[PDB]
């Protein structure tokens, strides 16, 4: 019983975090086998970030200009290259704590855990979602760049995010571990405005199934709807349109609870049109959209790693 | 920028989790140096839990009746004793991953991280508070008993909670690592009802300071109050009374923001009397009370471990 914002256990990732220093800039790197991945803006000064030419700035850097420390363990840089917006630093020593891993590029609406780090040292772990406008609502201070987001499946760490930028609106932008930004964001200090922060409808439905499994049932009504009728309502409230692919993914939660997906959509329609009347669901006074269907099944079934 | 429910990095605790089996009961244990700590109800069947006599049940158990596995690592039990509601199993091998640690008994209102485990394997990590009625609002399924709560201070893991029971209302009860229950709860399946779940006033004020640091400022008003006038209002809304000790702990957040503690209390008074008018603070539509003053300073200053 109970439903919490639950992060993956962070130990497999903690063992991969290092400090990367270039001149007077220090941030975090990820040490996997004999490669350290970090944001390419490690090579920039504050002035450089207004309009950086990364190819030109990197010409002035040699292997010996990159200082990499794994706790107190000095790692020797024997090669460097730029891949999109990340630097790959080849080091002399394979990380002995390298977990089984893959690099994945996640879709908007997918959730992950963030290990917030400073100077190569873990600070804390929390759950995030890739927003539909390709930002994340993180918690990141100066020095957190190169902190990573991940999922775990049994023995395997899937890295999906590396932190690069805070936007002036205080939301966060970053890359996959191939160094491609999520969304239209760039690693320069310019006018970059985020698009509409739309609600992840399939996640809200997953969380209402979690509420029913936990005994919060007041919002169940005698109504049903259709995908097209529900979607007229989703549009008005800046919800993502619901697709048959979404209905199919909610199948297992439907089967476990005996509540048809379109009946749960009718329950969500009434919540959107009438509000919550000062009531709570799983201790929230708002509709929560940072739990996936998989997240709900995992927490409600006790899956381990 | 940003404020999240942030757990401590879990790796130092992951390395301490083991599986303990006694007859047909499996739960989690904590392996520190050459001792495994686990709930004494590992020795009970389902029928035993209605009215267990732990001294009598333990007479039928020898060292060889306790099976302890650290992943695939079989640990040999060379002694056992009961301390309050925990069993101490002496094993032949010191855990090589033992962190610097202490056992602390926490006060109501203090927060901690939980590493939810099943069969000795970590599932997830989340932040909890000890409620004023000595329950926690966790996320625990069958098999989670012996999962632990902790804080980290630099190199040192402070263990404060071991999970034992779910109450019929679906909230959670447990012990310190000396095996003394928080509050009046006992390890038997009986009528145990929780007292009033009162709101932790000092934590709500800490979180309003966090909101101001992050630019959410709409709730700041032109009012002040006194401790006695505020406390008349706290009582009506089932808030904990605010003491001068609480005002003193909020001193650093007051100094950082230039907002007097009694001015922030006047802001909280108006929120309690008038509600939030459908507005949000740090992405919440309710007043959040599971962040301590120390938690806010830690997240707002980037403290590492």
Curated annotation (Swiss-Prot), chains A, B:
Changing residue 49 to A: Does not affect ability to cleave and inactivate human TRMT1. There is a cross-link at residues 5, 90 (Glycyl lysine isopeptide (Lys-Gly) (interchain with G-Cter in ubiquitin)). It is found in: Host cytoplasm; Host Golgi apparatus; Host nucleus. It catalyses: TSAVLQ-|-SGFRK-NH2 and SGVTFQ-|-GKFKK the two peptides corresponding to the two self-cleavage sites of the SARS 3C-like proteinase are the two most reactive peptide substrates. The enzyme exhibits a strong preference for substrates containing Gln at P1 position and Leu at P2 position. Residues 1-305 form the Peptidase C30 domain. The active site is at residues 41, 145. Inhibited by pyridone-containing alpha-ketoamides compounds 13a and 13b. In turn, alpha-ketoamide 13b (tert-butyl (1-((S)-1-(((S)-4-(benzylamino)-3,4-dioxo-1-((S)-2-oxopyrrolidin-3-yl)butan-2-yl)amino)-3-cyclopropyl-1-oxopropan-2-yl)-2-oxo-1,2-dihydropyridin-3-yl)carbamate) inhibits SARS-CoV-2 replication in human lung cells. Inhibited ex vivo by michael acceptor inhibitor N3. Inhibited ex vivo by compound 11a and 11b. Residues 1-305 are cytoplasmic. Cleaves the C-terminus of replicase polyprotein at 11 sites. Recognizes substrates containing the core sequence [ILMVF]-Q-|-[SGACN]. Cleaves and inactivates human TRMT1, preventing tRNA guanine(26)-dimethylation of tRNAs. May cleave human NLRP1 in lung epithelial cells, thereby activating the NLRP1 inflammasome pathway. May cleave human GSDMD, triggering alternative GSDME-mediated epithelial cell death upon activation of the NLRP1 inflammasome, which may enhance the release interleukins 1B, 6, 16 and 18. Also able to bind an ADP-ribose-1''-phosphate (ADRP). 3CL-PRO exists as monomer and homodimer. Only the homodimer shows catalytic activity. Interacts with host FBXO22; this interaction promotes the proteasomal degradation of nsp5. This is 3C-like proteinase nsp5. It comes from Severe acute respiratory syndrome coronavirus 2.
């Amino acid at each position: 019983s109970g439903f919490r914002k639950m992060a993956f256990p962070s130990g497999k990732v903690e063992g991969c975090m290092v400090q990367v220093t270039c001149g007077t800039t220090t941030l975090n790197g990820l040490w996997l086998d004999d490669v350290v991945y970090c944001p390419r803006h490690v090579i920039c000064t504050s002035e450089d970030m207004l309009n950086p030419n990364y190819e030109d700035l990197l010409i002035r850097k040699s292997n010996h200009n990159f200082l990499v420390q794994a706790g107190n363990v000095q790692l020797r840089v024997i090669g460097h290259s730029m891949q999109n917006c990340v630097l790959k630093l080849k080091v002399d020593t394979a990380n002995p704590k390298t977990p089984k891993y893959k690099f994945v590029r996640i879709q908007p609406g997918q959730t992950f855990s963030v290990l917030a780090c400073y100077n190569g040292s873990p600070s804390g772990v929390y759950q995030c979602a890739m927003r539909p406008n390709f930002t994340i609502k993180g918690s990141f201070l100066n020095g957190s760049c190169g902190s990573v987001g991940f999922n775990i499946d049994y023995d395997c760490v899937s890295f999906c995010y590396m932190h690069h930028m805070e936007l002036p609106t205080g939301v966060h932008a970053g890359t996959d571990l191939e160094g491609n930004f999520y969304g239209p964001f760039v690693d320069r200090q310019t006018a970059q405005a985020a698009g509409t922060d739309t609600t992840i409808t399939v996640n809200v439905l997953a969380w209402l199934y979690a509420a029913v499994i936990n005994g919060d049932r007041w919002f169940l009504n005698r109504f049903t709807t259709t995908l097209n009728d529900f979607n007229l309502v989703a549009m008005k409230y800046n919800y993502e349109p619901l697709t048959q692919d979404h209905v199919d993914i909610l199948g297992p939660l439907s089967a476990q609870t005996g509540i048809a997906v379109l009946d749960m959509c009718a329950s969500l329609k009434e919540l959107l049109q009438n509000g919550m009347n000062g009531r709570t669901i799983l201790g929230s006074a708002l509709l929560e959209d940072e739990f996936t269907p998989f997240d709900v099944v995992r927490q409600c079934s006790g899956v381990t790693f």
